[PDB]
Every structure is written in C-alpha cells, then in structure tokens.
Design a protein around this ligand. Structure first.
Ligand code: ATP
Ligand code: LAB
Ligand code: LAB
Ligand code: CA
Lengths: 373, 119
C-alpha cells in the first residue's frame, strides 16, 4: 500500500525498522552515526557530511562513530535525526510525510524527550500521524497478553517492567545499566586470564560474536565451574577472521553470569532475578500472582541458552513456596518489541489513538502525553 | 451548555457514572446512580495514591499524573478514569470492566476541556 504505517524500534545498539503488518523488521542496522574525523572541531567547518548504520561502519577509517542512544535514552538529537532520516529514505525508501509512524521508547523516558521526538516527527519529517509506545509494553503485547512482568535486556540497558492492562506500573520499574555491550567488554577481560589479548574496537566486535555464538547461562554456576575445572567437556573452539582458532572454557557461562551477579563487573546492583522479585513487590498485592505467572523475556541479551530455566529456578527460590511461576521466552524475542509495534499499528481499535498532524498543530508537543499511555 | 448536561451526556456506552470534583474536594455535580467521596478522590489524584475506593470497591491506581487518573478493580468490577478541567476540577467516570479505559480517557478529557470554559 501507498500509505502503510511504519514501525521504528530505536535501540542503544540496533535500529529495527519496517512496515506495520509485516512479521519481521525489513531493516535491522547499527544505531551509529559517523562524521568525518577531525572535522567535529575545525576552523570554518560545518557538519555537512555524515553516514549512518552499516555505511558508517564501512567507512570507519575516515569517520568518528557515535551512538545517539545511551542506555535506551536519546542523548544526541542531531545524530538521532540522522538515524531517522536514514531509516525513512535509505532503509525503508519511503516519503515520511505519507506514512503514519509508530516509534518506541524506554520506560521513564523524560517528558522533554517524548515531546522532542514528537516535535521532530511532525515539524521536521512532516509525518501525517505518530505514536510512541514503551518497548516492554510492545514485547508483552507481542506475547499475546497485557499483564505480566517483562525482563527487557538489549545492548545498553536492562529493565524489569511490571505491566497491568498495558500500563507500566507506578514506582515498580527497574533500570539496570548492565546489558549486552557490558557483557562483551567483560568477556574481553576474562579471556585475558586465558592468555588472549582482545582489546581494540575491531577485537570487541569479534568478542561480541563469540558471546552470541558460544555463551550460555549455567543452571547452577558453582556446579558448572566444577565441571569446567575437572574436564574439557564444556570447552569450544572459535575460528577468528584470519583463520586462527582459540578455545573458550568457563568464560562461556561466566560472561552472562554477570546478569545474576553484577559484582563480577564491580556493580553493586542485585542480579536480574532479585530485581524481578523487587519489582513485583512494588506492585499491588492483588496483581503479583499474575506477574509471577507471566514473566516475559525480550531483547537480544535474553537470548542466552539456559536463561529461562535459570530465571525459573531463581524466582522460585525468592517467591512464596506455592507460587505459580512461568517464564515465557519467545524464539522471536530479539525482535518482539518491533513485532508488538507491527501488530498494534495494524489493529483496527488502535487507529483512533494515532496522534494526527491536526492534533499536534492544536495541542503542541505535549499531545504525546494525552494520547500515548 | 450546563455542568449537569456536559457530565451527564458522558454516560453512554462503557461510561456508567460521572462526577465533577473541585480541587477542594467539593462535588459540583455527580450522576445520581452513585455517590463519590470527593475529598478522598481528589487526594488520590493530588498525592498519587496507590488506590481509590468508591462505594466499597477498591480500584488499583495504574496510571496517575497531573492530567490523568486510571484505576482498575483487579477483581473485574470496572475502572475509574479521571481527567482535569484546566486545573480547576477533576472529572471522573466509572467505566465498565470490558470497556477500554484508554478510549474512555480520551472522551473524559475532551469533556474536561469543555468543562474548563464554564468553571
Ligand atoms: N544470541 C545472542 N546471545 C547473546 N546476546 C545476543 C544474542 N544476539 C544478540 N545479542 C546481543 O543483544 C544486543 C542487541 O539486542 P537488542 O537489539 O535487543 O538491543 P538494543 O535495542 O539495541 O539495546 P537496548 O534495548 O539496550 O537499548 C547486543 O548486545 C547483542 O550482542
Ligand atoms: C500502550 C498500549 C498498551 C496495550 O497493551 O494495548 C493493548 C491493545 C489496545 C488496543 C487499543 C488501545 C486504545 C490502543 C493503544 C494502547 C496500546 O487495547 C488495550 O488497551 C486493551 C486493554 S486490556 C485489553 O485486552 N485491551 C490493550
Ligand atoms: C551485527 C551487529 C550486531 C550488533 O548488535 O551491533 C550493535 C551496534 C554496534 C555498532 C558498531 C559495530 C562495529 C557495527 C555493526 C555490528 C552490528 O555495536 C555493538 O556491536 C556493541 C559493541 S560490542 C557489543 O556487544 N555491542 C552492538
Ligand atoms: Ca531495545
């Protein structure tokens, strides 16, 4: 169709973008903006050239690369505008003025940021309509329910988000700035103990791949450490781009163990199991049962084999003895936020909730608070 | 048109009762099929309290701020949805459990915007 709604899910690491009604995002690309080196501060020099996503990475040798979203929050608005322009014109190949656009945000996103997104979409991109939803709310909806507690963990941030009828519950949301990029950095560190030397940005990307391919969450960490010490059964080979092969052992499970033991990287936070429990306890006593029964995992950092079973074990140990507990870990969960957006934007009853250009013209940027909740 | 007319005409579809409450707690008008504790209701709004009780039914507050109140009885007895009329009064509506509090809020906020001009 000429005017199909768009769905853009902006993450700290990856942009997921596509068309409402599609089963998967058409475009998944790095949330990076590259600008010519040494031209950020130079006499009489403007900011005319820039590159986004995979093209920025291809030209890394002549560009300085930045992430416009930090821990799920937009912090560089000029570069964020470039991400959005690139999404519309280069990735989706649409005229934004012809398509309603659904976007996503972190829970507790500040008012100024919500208004600024809205302003940019209407005043800069001239979209006919816009909506923004909380990422965890979309993931929950993608799983076929509107009540549950989401563990949302990506590249930059992890949240525990308890939700009832699609509302993220007052006072109960937890943010932890420990996610996939930190786990990659930690894996680089602990591989040094084995006699490897992963240090550079290019080497970081190799370790990200090692992490994604070979890491898993141990069901019992101390038992798994004993198994790794006594035998080579858990060891795996990994072929580097140049053809050289290395061996990874207990680092496979020590890396994502950090989610459950943040002290591994010197963080004082309790682990994701305990913050799930703490979040549930900040909710209405009469809602808690339904949260325990509907733990939904979303985001790339929830992809580790064993994580669902580990969470089931750990939450069971914290919860009341007879509590019915269920972890739902959809196979699609690296894209479930986006998928939730696609389903919602296509829904007949949703259409009344689009912010229209006329509504923006009458009410201004705070229209987002009237309609997006 | 009148206060009674604006608040009364909201009673259609999923919306079953309404009340217009000054920031003092004084009830200017409410539909005759219920009786709200105006001081209690306005304090839940002002202080962002975790529940609102109307006629022995506890509604758990799931969204509350300067412009909006959404509360739901977890046992399935319905919702209370509030919007604010130009910082002068809180307009609340009872919404049937099967009704969507989001679309009810849109209608209640629209009426609150109209009420602001006659308060
Ligand atoms: N199979 C996997 N196992 C472990 N980690 C993975 C896997 N696949 C992807 N990841 C990690 O998930 C992260 C990307 O996930 P995602 O797209 O959900 O994050 P994001 O939305 O960019 O970030 P955030 O939600 O933190 O703002 C990266 O750190 C990536 O290495
Ligand atoms: C933020 C959000 C949450 C949600 O879970 O949305 C879903 C889908 C939504 C569609 C209509 C609504 C008016 C539009 C958008 C709200 C979307 O209906 C719901 O609000 C209602 C409440 S519980 C239910 O089953 N449907 C839930
Ligand atoms: C395939 C892929 C995965 C990813 O998650 O990419 C995102 C975005 C990416 C941007 C820089 C990188 C050099 C470019 C592209 C890699 C994109 O940074 C990440 O790799 C960062 C750095 S290491 C890590 O774990 N996260 C995450
Ligand atoms: Ca994300």
């Amino acid at each position: 169709d000429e005017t199909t709604a768009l769905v853009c899910d902006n993450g700290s690491g990856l942009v997921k973008a596509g068309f409402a009604g599609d089963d998967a995002p058409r475009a998944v690309f790095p949330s990076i903006v590259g600008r010519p080196r040494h031209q950020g501060v130079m006499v009489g020099m403007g900011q005319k050239d820039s590159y986004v996503g995979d093209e920025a990475q291809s030209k890394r040798g002549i560009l300085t690369l930045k992430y416009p979203i930090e821990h799920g929050i937009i912090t560089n608005w000029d570069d964020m505008e470039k991400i959005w322009h690139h999404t519309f014109y280069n990735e989706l190949r649409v005229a934004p003025e012809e398509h309603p656009t659904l976007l996503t945000e972190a829970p507790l996103n500040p008012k100024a940021n919500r208004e600024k997104m809205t302003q940019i979409m209407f005043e800069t991109f001239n979209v006919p309509a816009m909506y923004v939803a909380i990422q965890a709310v979309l993931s929950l909806y993608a799983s076929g329910r509107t009540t549950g507690i989401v563990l949302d963990s990506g590249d930059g941030v992890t949240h525990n988000v308890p939700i009832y009828e699609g509302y993220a519950l007052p006072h109960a949301i937890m943010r932890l700035d420990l996610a996939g990029r930190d786990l990659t950095d930690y894996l680089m560190k602990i591989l040094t103990e084995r006699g490897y030397s992963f240090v550079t940005t290019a080497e970081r990307e190799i370790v990200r791949d090692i992490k994604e391919k070979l890491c898993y969450v141990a069901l019992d960490f101390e038992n798994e450490m004993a198994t790794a010490a006594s035998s080579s059964s858990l060891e795996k080979s990994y072929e580097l781009p140049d053809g050289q092969v290395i061996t990874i052992g207990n680092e496979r499970f020590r890396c994502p163990e950090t989610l459950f033991q943040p002290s591994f990287i010197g963080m004082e936070s309790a682990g994701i199991h305990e913050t799930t429990y703490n979040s549930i306890m900040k909710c209405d006593i009469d809602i808690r049962k339904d949260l325990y029964a509907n733990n939904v995992m979303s985001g790339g950092t929830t992809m580790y084999p064993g994580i669902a079973d580990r969470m089931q074990k750990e939450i069971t140990a914290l919860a009341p003895s007879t509590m019915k507990i269920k972890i739902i870990a959809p196979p699609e969960r690296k894209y479930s936020v986006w998928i939730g957006g696609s389903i919602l934007a296509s829904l007949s009853t949703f259409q009344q909730m689009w912010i229209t250009k006329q509504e923006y013209d009458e009410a201004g940027p705070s229209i987002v608070h009237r309609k997006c909740f | 048109m009148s206060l009674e007319q604006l608040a009364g005409r909201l009673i259609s579809g999923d919306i079953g009762a309404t009340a217009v409450i000054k920031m003092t707690g004084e009830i200017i008008y409410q539909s005759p099929n219920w009786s709200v504790d105006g001081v209690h209701a306005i304090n839940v709004y002002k202080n962002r309290e975790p529940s609102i009780i109307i006629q022995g039914v506890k509604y758990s507050v799931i969204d509350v701020n300067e412009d909006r109140l959404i509360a739901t009885n977890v046992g399935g007895q319905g919702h209370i949805v509030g919007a604010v009329a130009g910082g002068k009064a809180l307009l609340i509506g009872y919404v049937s459990p099967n009704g969507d509090a989001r679309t009810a809020y849109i209608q209640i906020d629209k009426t609150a915007r109209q009420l602001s001009k006659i308060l």
